[PDB]
Every structure is written in C-alpha cells, then in structure tokens.
Amino acid sequence: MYVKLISSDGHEFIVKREHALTSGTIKAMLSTNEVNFREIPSHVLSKVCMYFTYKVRYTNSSTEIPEFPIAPEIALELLMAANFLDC
Amino acid sequence: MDVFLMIRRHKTTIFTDAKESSTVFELKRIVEGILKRPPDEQRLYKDDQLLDDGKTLGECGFTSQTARPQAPATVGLAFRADDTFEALCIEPFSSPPELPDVM
C-alpha cells in the first residue's frame, strides 16, 4: 500500500505507507490516504521522500552508510519542513 | 540488487525500488498497481529513450551505482489514450530561492 503526499505547488509524491509512517506527524495526518502540505514546495518534499527511502535502507546496516546529501539552496527550507515533521 | 527509482509523469512521482534483474514490463505492473493503468497503455523511458518490455532494469542503465536510495534514478512514464500515446511529459519541481547572502 502507498500514500500520496502533495506539495504546495501541486506535485503528487506517491511513496510506500511504511516509509511515510516514519514521520509521526504524517501518521497523525493520515489517521486518510492523501496528505496536502500547503507550505512545503516540491523541491523540499522530493528530498523528504528520498530521506524516507534512505532511512529505511540504511537503518540497521553493518555496511558503510553514505552521507545524505543536501544542496545548500534547499537546506533552509528542508530544515523547516524537517522541524515541522519531526524527522 | 535493489535499484531505487522515481517513476515520473506530469506532476506525479512514484518512489519505489526494484531488482536490477526485474523487467521493464514488471515495473509496468508495479505502476499498474498504483495508478490503475494497464501496461499496454504505458511507456517507460530512460531520459528520452523508450525502454523495451523484456529488458532488465540493469540493461536499461538502472544499477546500484546510478539508482541509490538517497539519489534515485528517474523513469519517465507516458500513458496511452484512445490508442495514441501522449508524448513524454515530466513537469519540473519548484525552484529554490536565491541563496541567502549569509550563506
């Protein structure tokens, strides 16, 4: 099963429920299969979704973990979303 | 090996993963589950190159090196209406503000 996170500019990001439930805030906003984020543009949310993939793959890895990459021009908006979403 | 993908059409973006040995057609099945469109009504592209149903995602250039969790490869998706496929169209993401002078 998947859920749909919609950005402030209309983009529709469709990610696995299990990944999106990592965020307690998104759990609360689903608890119902879509979430509209009026204040997160798609260049932030696309990065959020990548972090979902990254956290699920590299949590509990004895292998080497790679840095999660953040371009400087996104860093401040990503921070604000991450602070809101507790992520 | 798992490959990590964004499947993109219009203002739609699917985050999913697949085996390198998986087929283009089997990916079309994945899409079929999310978006409810049959594979015969779907085209998948790497950049602007149409991909063939029998080829593995590896032979289409999706690998551990190029399709990572924190940097997934993009697969273009185009739908067929009335027995005529629309052109590949992928709307870009929003644009970042200019970097603050403080940075």
Place this chain on the structure above:
Amino acid sequence: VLRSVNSREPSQVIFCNRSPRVVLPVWLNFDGEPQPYPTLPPGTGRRIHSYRGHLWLFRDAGTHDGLLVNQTELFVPSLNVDGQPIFANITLPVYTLKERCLQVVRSLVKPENYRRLDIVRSLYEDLEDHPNVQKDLERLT
C-alpha cells in the same frame, strides 16, 4: 562514572574510519575527562595500542557530530583473541533529517549570523546547540 578501567592489560586495535568525515578519536581517561587523539582522515586506518576496559568514542573532528563505532556510541577494547587486533569500524549514523539540515546549515553560516537567517526562533536555538562531547557524555551518564 563513564571512565576507562586501568586494567593495564594491553589491547591492540585498528581504528577503521568508514565515513566521509575526518574522525577525531576520543579516549575517556581514568577520571572521565575526554582526551583527543590525532585525527583519522576519511577511509584511512590506524593501528592503536590501547587496553582492556578503556572507553573510546568518535566524532567529526570539525563539527563534533557524533559517529558510530561498531554500530554503537562507545568502543571498549576487549581481549585480543588469537593475537588478532580488535576492529573498530567508524561509520556515519543515520542522522535525523533535522539534525542533518542543522549540520549543513552550520557549515554555511557563521554563528553570529545565525540570527540573520529567517526561520522560527526555536531553530536558532537548535542551531546554536552545537554537538559537544562533554554534553553527550552527561546524556550517556
């Protein structure tokens, strides 16, 4: 309370830095005071002579971001079995997305100009609460 044990039993150890960061090894002496050792460049290794019951932790030599050693915070040299030395694999944690952004924003802005950025004032505090080994040590205690 968090202190090395003066076992005087030597333990041979390799510090393997499997991280893209410059690793600062940190030994907790017998009174609990953290003592820094020479930095370990990314992807490099170093044979070290330590002792059983000693406490090591590892950080980014520049930002003091916490790192993992053998998937945990603290490394305790153990008995060298068969003569082969203990292997301390230093890796990146999976930082939260918030902390990761804090790391990246600290690297771009000098701390006087943190206030100059336009964000909820609650983030200006998070940004000034730099990772620090004395702080983390109280957490573990």
